[PDB]
């Protein structure tokens, strides 16, 4: 279990090894079985000067080859060594190296005017930031409504029902699911907010003149033959959506083909997995 | 209970980075949709962000870097190639149709919300599109073209003396760091993998410079970090940070590629652990601006930011995922939470305490009483 | 044949679905120079372009 | 009404939901709720769940309908005997209402 410094026959630094077994033969000759510690070069910088790797290479050599004893510590114990106790004899290991395979456990920051940002000075108590909020945002849902969860929930059911009845006027479960998709819901939450959270006013919006409204996402909206085109273009060009349009669906806008793609990936008849 | 403002533009899910590319904006649309069906949408103030114009993007970036972005297309892609190389647009930052539109929405969300925070008409403001933290003044990097974060922070400085920037993303937030490297008004704290990983920056010894020295905190990490290890090193450090840097507005980048089973990431965090950080920050009751960032196993990105939105509303949600347009995306399980993997945590207690202590020293160098 | 914006002007990429056999349904990716020369792998493309482009981070399959 | 009967044929369900019984019920729902549109709509979706009104036409089973067409073709318009011998579990007055609708 001890670690030793063997002869380096070339004149170079000593080879390091761990003693697995010490053997004496009948004629009193002493031989040792030893696991090799490899040097970083020999393992054929983050590697320190005194890095050694524990190999799966096993050799046996006579005891006369041993010139000195050493310590090959854990990484933590090497880093903890004091400046005075630093020696030629201290080495460390943190890696096991397969010598046969080659296997091993498993960029600059700049300064200057052209790198840093000019820091924006704090405004005086009298100074004003001068930022037009309408040019920056437009609100889509207020969180403090005169409405209760129940009523919003209820409205969402209604928004769904209209939608199903809409697509009944030019498959029952199919139309209902179609009408239950998110686009219809999102549209239902906007219809509320646009109408100032007045349920009675918002419902008119949904049935403008006795006629219902239809919201269809790209999934539902595409024709049978467009859908068909898409499944040919994908299976032929993979996920290259600009070429899929150029050559297969050039009348559609790229971003509609994207939206469709993702929605199509959940398709039932779609089974790429097993 | 804190008031939350949520920023979203429907178009953002539909912009596409390119075949074979890991960054997929669609993950925000997935979140959006869960939020609606988990009933959370209902409970917060929902804003569509108008497009940020070159006017306010050049408040940090080059007049001719933005000019380049406004101009570049896939049409004139072979005509510009000169400028393409000077600005880093290629191998892992593709050109793609709508690119500049995408940037405007991400930046608009963050800026609008910053204003909202300065105008003191919210407590928390959320923009999952934003958080794109690798961008530089005069070049794109790591999927980031415009650094919405910097711009956001620059607006906050108009009302806030000290702005704290916290970055959970597995990748070191070098864009936000470099932009504020020489100032004492903004402190950039970042916990990330380090060693054969992008962006190559943010080791223990990355402390800042000039007036900004002792104001850039970093925590370098190896693979496989638990929720338990992460929690035990985040809370101590952040409490000291608050203690010392005493900020008046927080900006938390909630990068979701620090979660377990990410495509690019190699950390072992659960939504629960990841969120515990957001909850801890929120607890310090400061004007807060949650942004997203990285995340490349989008099913979990969706889960995470949905959950973390609940946290900002301190409302409970069930593990049962609600039906939605993309419901079928979520495995055989259709649950909200993820559990950690058998993956081995190479962040030994000894290694974390060495670093922790070094940082506690760095933070002590700040003024106090 | 689609323009590949990250390569120099005129370079194009095409993806072809295999129609039969062992890998029916899988695809192969090809690149074409401006003159129309066809390339079938990353090392072949990198050998042709040499130091005029750095392809270290180039994803042959997606063209990004 | 159509969305109600979608939760356990599209045009059929819509027509079913468009029959008079549903309308009459809609005019009462208004009056009972004091002509408050917002209040009346809650009535229609009591707890997030819709309401179904089905007249005897729609309500009868396939096999009851069948029974009726045998009883008529066999006893003509003698509706007490049609019940006694063919649909004895139904009330006479429901068989009448059905007849006319049929
Ligand atoms: O449609 P994309 O945006 O290109 O992403 C897909 C998608 O990943 P997401 O579902 O996370 O978006 C596939 O997942 P499924 O459609 O199979 O659920 C995934 O397949 P695996 O999850 O089986 O890896 C595939 O990866 P690959 O192309 O390696 O098959 C990957 O495409 P990208 O790798 O181009 O992102
Ligand atoms: K980070
Ligand atoms: K700094
Ligand atoms: Zn990242």
Q: Delimit the domains of chain B by residue range.
A: 1-369
Identify whether the C-beta of residue C23 lies closer than 8 Å to the C-beta of residue C33. no
Please spell the DSSP secondary structure of chain A, one letter per residue. --EEEE--TTSSSPEEEEEEEEEE-TTS-EEEEEEEEEPTTT----S-TTB-EEEEEEEEEEGGGEEEEEEEEEHHHHHH--TTT--TTEEEE--EE-TTT----------STTTSPPPPPPPPSS------GGGTEEEEE-SS-SS-HHHHHHHHHHHHHHHHHHHHT--HHHHHHHHTSHHHHHHHHHHHHHTTT-HHHHHHHHSTTS-------HHHHS-HHHHHHHHHHHHHHTT-HHHHHHHT-TTS-HHHHHHHHHHHTT-SS-----
What was the elucidation method? cryo-EM
Name the closest residue on chain B to residue C2, using Cα atoms.
B74
Identify whether the C-beta of residue B10 lies closer than 8 Å to the C-beta of residue A106. no
- If one counts every other C-beta atom within 10 angstroms of the C-beta of residue A196, the result is 11
CA pair distance B366, B246, nearest whole angstrom: 10
Long-range contacts of B78-83 (CB under 8 A, 24+ apart): B78/C3, B78/C5, B78/C8, B78/C9, B78/C10, B79/C9, B81/C8, B81/C9
| Positions of B marked catalytic | 134
Contacts of B77 in chain C (CB under 8 A): 3, 5-6, 9
CA B290 remoteness from chain centre: 8
CA pair distance A188, A195, nearest whole angstrom: 11
Contacts of B154 in chain A (CB under 8 A): 117, 119-120
Q: How many residues does chain C have?
A: 64
B133-B138-B142-B143 Cα dihedral, nearest 10 degrees: 90
Contacts of B94 in chain C (CB under 8 A): 5-6, 64
Q: B220 - beta bridge partners?
A: B192
Task: Report the nearest atom of ligand 1 relative to the CA of A239.
Answer: 4
Tokens of A216: 């269809």
Q: Which of B202, B205, B344, B341 is nearest to B260 (CA)?
A: B341
CA C19 remoteness from chain centre: 20
Instruction: Classify B82 as helix, strand or coil.
Output: helix
The best mutation among B20, B256, B259, B338 to test binding of ligand 1, ranked by most ligand atoms within 8 Å of the C-beta, falls on B20
CB contact under 8 A, A242 and C2: yes
Query: Which residues, 6 or more positions from A200, have their beta carbon under 8 angstroms from its beta carbon?
Result: D36, D37, D38
Q: A70 - beta bridge partners?
A: A3
Identify whether the C-beta of residue A95 lies closer than 8 Å to the C-beta of residue A104. yes
CA pair distance A104, B32, nearest whole angstrom: 43
Task: Report the nearest atom of ligand 1 relative to the CA of B19.
Answer: 35
Q: Distances in Å between the alpha carbon of C54 and those of B301, C33, C34?
A: 32, 16, 18
- Backbone torsions φ then ψ of B176, nearest 5 degrees: -70, -30
Distance of residue D69 Cα from the nearest chain A Cα, in angstroms: 28
Considering every ligand atom shown, identify the ligand nearest to the alpha carbon of residue B331 and give its number: 1
Name the closest residue on chain A to residue B313, using Cα atoms.
A143
Check CB contact of B64 with chain A, cutoff 8 Å: no
Tokens 């990429």 -> residue: C13
Q: B6 - beta bridge partners?
A: B46, B126
Span between the terminal Cα atoms of chain A, in Å = 52
CA pair distance A171, A177, nearest whole angstrom: 10
Considering every ligand atom shown, identify the ligand nearest to the alpha carbon of residue B141 and give its number: 4
CA pair distance B152, B190, nearest whole angstrom: 18
Identify whether the C-beta of residue B3 lies closer than 8 Å to the C-beta of residue B124. yes
Tokens 């504020």 -> residue: B180
- Residue A77 Ramachandran class (φ > 0 left, ψ -120 to 50 alpha, else beta): alpha
Tokens 């063209």 -> residue: C63
Residue B92 among known ligand-binding residues: no
Name the closest residue on chain B to residue A125, using Cα atoms.
B159
Give the residue whose CA is nearest to atom 34 of ligand 1. B20
Tokens 């085109």 -> residue: A229
Instruction: Classify B185 as helix, strand or coil.
Output: coil
Check CB contact of B219 with chain A, cutoff 8 Å: no
Identify whether the C-beta of residue B328 lies closer than 8 Å to the C-beta of residue B321. no
Identify whether the C-beta of residue B126 lies closer than 8 Å to the C-beta of residue B309. yes
CA pair distance B181, D88, nearest whole angstrom: 91
- Containing D69, the helix (H) or strand (E) segment is helix D62-75
CB contact under 8 A, C6 and B94: yes
Task: Report the nearest atom of ligand 1 relative to the CA of A273.
Answer: 17
Query: Which residues, 6 or more positions from A193, have their beta carbon under 8 angstroms from its beta carbon?
Result: A139, A140, A141, A142
* A vs D: CB pairs below 8 A: 63
Residue B171 among known ligand-binding residues: yes
Check CB contact of C6 with chain B, cutoff 8 Å: yes
How many angstroms is the resolution? 19.4
Burial of D13 (C-beta count, 10 Å sphere; 0-12/13-18/19+): buried
Name which of A161, A172, A175 is nearest D50 (Cβ-Cβ): A161
Task: Report the nearest atom of ligand 1 relative to the CA of B24.
Answer: 3
Residue B24 among known ligand-binding residues: yes
Residue B208 among known ligand-binding residues: no
CA pair distance D26, A146, nearest whole angstrom: 26
Residue B169 among known ligand-binding residues: yes
Contacts of C10 in chain B (CB under 8 A): 78
Identify whether the C-beta of residue C33 lies closer than 8 Å to the C-beta of residue C21. no
Chains A and D touch (3+ CB pairs under 8 A): yes
Q: Which of C39, C42, C34, C44 is nearest to C9 (CA)?
A: C34
CA pair distance B112, B52, nearest whole angstrom: 9
At the top level of CATH, the class of B1-369 is alpha beta
Tokens of A217: 């996402």
Task: Say how many Å lie between the CA of residue B297 and the centre of ligand 1.
Answer: 9
Burial of B147 (C-beta count, 10 Å sphere; 0-12/13-18/19+): buried
Name the closest residue on chain A to residue C17, using Cα atoms.
A236
Considering every ligand atom shown, identify the ligand nearest to the alpha carbon of residue A273 and give its number: 1
For chain A positions 161-220, those within 8 Å of chain D (CB to CB) are 161, 164-165, 167-169, 171-176, 179, 198-200, 203
CB contact under 8 A, A161 and D13: no
Q: What ranges make up the beta strands (E) of chain C?
A: 2-3, 12-17, 27-32, 38-39
Identify whether the C-beta of residue C13 lies closer than 8 Å to the C-beta of residue C31. yes
Tokens 């549109």 -> residue: D37
- Ligand 1: residues with CB < 6 A are A 239, 265, 272; B 20, 24, 298
For chain B positions 339-358, those within 8 Å of chain A (CB to CB) are 344, 346, 348, 350-351, 354
Contacts of B36 in chain A (CB under 8 A): 182, 185-186, 189
Identify whether the C-beta of residue B265 lies closer than 8 Å to the C-beta of residue B258. yes
Task: Report the nearest atom of ligand 1 relative to the CA of B298.
Answer: 11
Instruction: Classify D31 as helix, strand or coil.
Output: helix
Asked, as a colleague might, if the bond just before B317 is cis with ω within 30 of 0, I would say no
Tokens 């949408």 -> residue: B41
CA pair distance B167, B173, nearest whole angstrom: 6
Contacts of C25 in chain A (CB under 8 A): 235
CB contact under 8 A, B21 and C62: yes
Query: Residues followed by a break in chain C, C–N over 2.5 Å?
Result: none
Name the closest residue on chain B to residue A74, using Cα atoms.
B350
Residue B13 among known ligand-binding residues: no
Identify whether the C-beta of residue A259 lies closer than 8 Å to the C-beta of residue A241. no
Considering every ligand atom shown, identify the ligand nearest to the alpha carbon of residue B190 and give its number: 2
């Amino acid at each position: 279990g001890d670690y030793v410094y063997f002869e380096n026959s070339s004149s170079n630094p000593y080879l390091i090894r761990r003693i697995e077994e010490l053997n004496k033969t009948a004629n009193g000759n002493v031989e040792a079985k030893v696991v090799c510690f490899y040097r970083r070069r020999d393992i054929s910088h983050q590697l320190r000067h005194r890095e050694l790797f524990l190999s799966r290479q096993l050799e046996s050599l006579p005891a006369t080859h041993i010139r000195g004893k050493c310590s090959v510590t854990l990484l933590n114990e090497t880093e903890s060594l004091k400046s005075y106790l630093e020696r030629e004899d201290f080495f460390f290991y943190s890696l096991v190296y397969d010598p046969q395979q080659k296997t091993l456990a498993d960029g600059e920051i700049r300064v200057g005017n052209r790198y840093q940002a000019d820091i924006t000075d704090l405004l005086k108590e009298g100074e004003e930031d001068g930022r037009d909020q309408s040019r920056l945002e437009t609100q889509v849902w207020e969180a403090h409504n005169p409405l209760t969860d129940k009523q919003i929930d209820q409205f969402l059911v209604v928004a769904r029902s209209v939608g199903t009845f809409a697509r009944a006027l030019d498959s029952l479960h199919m139309s209902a699911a179609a009408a239950s998709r998110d686009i219809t819901l999102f549209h239902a939450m906007d219809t509320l907010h646009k109408n100032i959270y007045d349920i009675s006013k918002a419902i008119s919006a949904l049935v403008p003149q006795g006629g219902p409204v239809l919201c269809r996402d790209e999934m539902e909206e595409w024709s049978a033959s467009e859908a068909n085109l898409f499944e040919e273009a994908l299976e032929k060009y993979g996920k290259d959506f600009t070429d899929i349009q150029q050559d297969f669906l050039p009348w559609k806008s790229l971003t509609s083909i994207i939206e469709y793609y993702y929605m199509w990936k959940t398709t039932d008849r779609y089974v790429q997995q097993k | 209970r804190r008031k939350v403002c949520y920023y979203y533009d429907g178009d953002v899910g539909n912009y596409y980075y390119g075949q074979g590319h890991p960054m997929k904006p669609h993950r925000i649309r997935m979140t959006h949709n869960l939020l609606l069906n988990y009933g959370l949408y209902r409970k917060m103030e929902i804003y569509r962000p108008h497009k940020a114009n070159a006017e306010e993007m050049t408040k940090y970036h080059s007049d001719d870097y933005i000019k380049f972005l406004r101009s570049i297309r896939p049409d004139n892609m072979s005509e510009y190639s000169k400028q393409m190389q000077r600005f880093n647009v290629g191998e892992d930052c593709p050109v793609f149709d709508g690119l500049f539109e995408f940037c405007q929405l991400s930046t608009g969300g963050s800026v609008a919300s910053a204003v909202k925070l300065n105008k003191q008409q919210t407590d928390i403001a959320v923009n999952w599109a934003g958080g794109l933290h690798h961008a530089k003044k005069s070049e794109a990097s790591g999927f980031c073209y415009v650094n919405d974060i910097v711009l956001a922070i620059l607006e906050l400085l108009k009302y806030h003396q000290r702005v704290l920037y916290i970055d959970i993303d597995i990748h070191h937030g070098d864009g936000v760091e470099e932009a504020f490297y020489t100032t004492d008004r903004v402190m950039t704290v970042s916990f990330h993998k380090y060693g054969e990983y992008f962006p190559g920056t943010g080791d223990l010894r990355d402390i800042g410079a000039g007036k900004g020295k002792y104001y850039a905190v970093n925590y370098p990490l190896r693979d496989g970090i638990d929720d338990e290890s992460y929690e035990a090193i985040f809370k101590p450090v952040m409490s000291k940070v608050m203690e010392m840097f005493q900020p008046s507005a927080v900006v938390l980048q909630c990068g979701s590629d620090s979660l377990s089973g990410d495509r690019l990431g190699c950390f072992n965090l659960t939504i629960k652990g990841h969120a515990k950080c957001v909850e801890f920050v929120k607890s310090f009751n400061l004007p807060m601006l949650m942004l997203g960032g990285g995340g490349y196993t989008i099913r979990n990105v969706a889960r995470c930011w949905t959950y973390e939105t609940a946290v900002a509303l301190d409302t409970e949600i069930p593990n049962e995922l609600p039906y939605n347009d993309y419901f079928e995306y979520f495995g055989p399980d259709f649950k909200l939470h993820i559990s950690p993997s058998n993956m081995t945590n190479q962040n030994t207690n000894e290694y974390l305490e060495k670093i922790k202590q070094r940082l506690f020293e760095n933070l002590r160098m700040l003024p106090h009483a | 044949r689609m323009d590949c914006p990250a390569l120099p002007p005129g370079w194009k990429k095409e993806e072809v679905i295999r129609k039969s056999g062992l890998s029916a349904g899988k695809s192969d990716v090809y690149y074409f120079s401006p003159s129309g020369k066809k390339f079938r792998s990353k090392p072949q493309l990198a050998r042709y372009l040499g130091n005029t482009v750095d392809l270290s981070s180039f994803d042959f399959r997606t063209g990004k």
